[PDB]
Design a protein around this ligand. Structure first.
Ligand SMILES: [Mg+2]
Ligand SMILES: [Mg+2]
Ligand SMILES: [Mg+2]
Lengths: 306, 295, 292, 295
């Protein structure tokens, strides 16, 4: 009942996905405290490093693991917060922020704390400038996750606006630039803000589409606010008074419109003499994120489960 | 350039459309007060009766003409109120209500008055109970033809909820019941509320999609609202809304099936909901081909 | 504790409240099925008198009766499916119209029947004018509303069309024998929406605490989240907003007169809505109906 | 007259306002290329250093002048960016960024460049770590100065949430911190995020209240939004919004007491939060007296 409408975007996968997914995953299964075997198995099932390689297929060969580690740990935390109140979730996230900047050593007895620490240390050690560029976008993401807006009345327009942060658009962009060693100037970024905003809705909604059942479930099982159902699928379903599945099919078509928009905005940037080689590398990178994201969402067992 | 997405519905026109169209067009040409032979021609090509037959293809052969005459005069009046101030238009349609009720005689020298009077008298003579039943729906609409809107911040959900209560669609719905001789019980009409709301939105959004081009010139339409909430062109919005409409057609069938899967469907209801199906496909063909949205 | 801001509206109470209250409350106690029950402690007849201080002396009992049964029926409904109740009320409508006879062994039925027969026997034409308003309300008390993202503007627009408030409006016209022409009943659309909104928000302000015993959908919660202030702070701001609607009421009135003349009826009606707003406020502040 | 509701807050002006205003105004009168005598009288009568001392009455005595200079050049530039295109404007501010950084040398023949350059060099000389601390907030403000406003459906909650994140207000908070010598850690800052959000909103709405008539000659303001949402006049809306501002004032006091009650109120934060309180009362006095809102 969810045949993806046609797209001109073809995703790519990083050639070293096999290797990277091996180390990363082993690492977490080794240091991350698992509730039980049933959890560590589902962990391996989600395929977090394959998402990373799907998202950043053109990443440099020695930087793709950094990306798989950060997204993995963020996913792991992402779920943890669902059983917490906005207040608890916020405190959990806030203690990790100083640790991410490396201003507070981690309680080595708490995996989430030293994992976060080592990871960011590893990245700064590899490339400080770019590493540091990911810090505030990650912090932006983290604070959106438990933001009070999560409960206030919100239509499609306002939701897409809040989702940009909660989906971590900026974090992914900076992660992509870091991983590809793609440096852009403070004026090259400004030139692509419409492109980034457009891409953020696409990532967000495609994810909302496939993660709806999972969220509907934790909605009825997790914490009252932590697992609050906040998604475009529910919003559009209610606004149009159709089923969630109908909403998915309409939202999917809308995503294609954002894809067209992406192509149009890029041609625009290219039309006016503004498309620099770095930007070309970037905008094409965003496309990979949108297609990679969709492909993973269509397959991962993280979205096909109880 | 706007290509409609696939649909299980298809437009249908009343069998006697040719016959009735001549009958009703003639009558108004004979009685309506067109300012010139130009407007007359324009009127003939507008074919208000052909549109009516497109919307009520299932109307009874001897009732369909009442429907074309009613919409024809309402439409002529609609177009007429355009060139009238709001205070003027209101008193204009307001004088026609007692006349429509038959409580007040018409000045046989003012055509709108005697045409309205005679039309309603003829409707009651055919089916008093059913004619009386569409009095208020017509009046609610006539009074709406002249009131304002008063702008306010409004999103997709708000706009759609507002169109679900569109009195114009309620009129079309009531007039169709009269045309088909469908005497629905309050109990029957209550169980058909979701379907009616669903249908009303589809007719309204399809209008929006095709009227956008026209309306845009110098405000409240699903096309502009969706484009700004999703930050896409109006044209992209039209394509998404079109798919949404196909979703409402699917909801329509699901709802009809659920009503039937229960001991709720009724002979009248079965005919009623199918009638709505044709109003939706009918309205889409009209929106796609009417001059009302041209240029 | 929550000081309502200054108001130029003074509520009044119907002269016969005491006489009407005994009769109607008595009549219901001597006929209604709700077994223990704080009925005579429940305004109902006294609340109706706060809303229609100027109802005709021989029609006030009709209003108290209509609202008492509607509110008791509304109280019942909470014990039945949205369809057991839907059918429940859907049965009463033909009885209400006089078409169907009442099962004389069923309280709600003969009371419904007797009541409407009385109203028609007193003022047939006007009694019929409110048949629909009541039907809208009854049908409206069992239906379900589909959840939707609702901001303050959406919520307020919704309350502008509150069927309960439209019922109070029509019933007031009936109770005061005010016969408005569709022309006049078109000249006050704004005054009515503004009044309905005022009645609704005042109820919201006072019912918030009890209601929180829970989803909600109240201006209090909606404004607190949009402005990110406590519910108590939202009540104050909403209360001022209410004083602004009171002010707008006086403006829409002064305007109407200055316009194509008020009318003796409209002058009466409009003063009536004012009593509903002020009356509704005093009632909201004192009813146990909002007690925790 | 509006008649502002009671407030436990009051406006205060920096003790050295006369001195600093004369000093700063003088500097710009000598260096800034004013088109004509009328532009010079307008500049002195607008008193930007005076406004600045009203916002940061608690600034350290030897730092208030930097704030006056920074806000003065920023607003002179602001008024200028309106007479040039988004591209001319963006290129204009983008050229000043590396210069404000001290990375590009100014062309001494162009006032705005050496004025900007010398200004940031002096700030760094006085407190380089703190001066470096306000670079981004200023650049974020500068870039926002030429940004294109997205017109979309927006209710009260949406508009306020949007104002909670105003870059101009973050600039004010950042500049105040520099002016008060308040070196607050990221952790201390995070503790007052609800206070900053609350404050930013108060500032924006009070501006909204007083700038409305001028805005009324894509109007995005709380006055129009609340007026349409509650269906009242703009004047009534201003009135309700003002009360809402006093509620945000009480909220500010409650958040400050919590901060202390949880043992999280350091000396700097106590100084900071009181600073914000004067930004609210100061902005209010300014909004009621500035010619920028005349007509
Ligand atoms: Mg999640
Ligand atoms: Mg999440
Ligand atoms: Mg999701």
């Amino acid at each position: 009942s969810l045949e993806p409408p046609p797209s001109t975007f073809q995703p790519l996968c990083h050639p070293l996905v096999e290797e990277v997914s091996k180390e990363v995953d082993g690492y977490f299964l080794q240091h991350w405290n698992f509730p039980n075997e049933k959890a560590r198995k589902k962990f391996v099932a989600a395929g977090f490093s394959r998402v990373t390689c799907l998202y950043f297929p053109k990443a440099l060969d020695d930087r793709i693991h950094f990306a798989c580690r950060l997204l993995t740990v963020l996913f792991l935390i992402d779920d943890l917060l669902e059983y917490m109140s906005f207040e608890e979730g916020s405190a959990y996230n806030e203690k990790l922020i100083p640790i991410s900047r490396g201003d507070v050593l981690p309680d080595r007895s708490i995996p989430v704390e030293y994992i976060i620490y080592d990871l960011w240390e590893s990245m700064r050690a590899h490339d400080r400038e770019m590493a540091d560029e990911i810090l505030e976008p990650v912090f932006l993401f983290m604070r959106a996750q438990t933001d009070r807006t999560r409960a206030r009345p919100m239509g499609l327009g306002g939701y897409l606006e809040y989702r940009e942060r909660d989906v971590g658009k900026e974090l992914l962009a900076a992660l992509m630039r870091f991983s590809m060693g793609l440096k852009l100037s403070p004026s090259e970024l400004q030139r692509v803000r419409e492109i980034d905003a457009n891409c953020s809705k696409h990532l967000s909604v495609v994810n909302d589409i496939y993660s709806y059942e999972k969220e509907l479930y934790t909605s009825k099982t997790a914490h009252s606010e932590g697992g609050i159902l906040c998604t475009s699928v529910q919003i559009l379903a209610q606004e149009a008074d159709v089923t969630a599945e109908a909403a998915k099919r309409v939202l999917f078509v809308m995503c294609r419109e954002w894809e067209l928009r992406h192509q149009l905005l890029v041609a625009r940037l290219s039309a006016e003499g503004l498309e620099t080689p770095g930007l070309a590398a970037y905008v094409e990178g965003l496309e990979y994120q949108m297609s990679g994201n969709e492909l993973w969402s269509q397959t991962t067992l993280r979205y096909s489960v109880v």
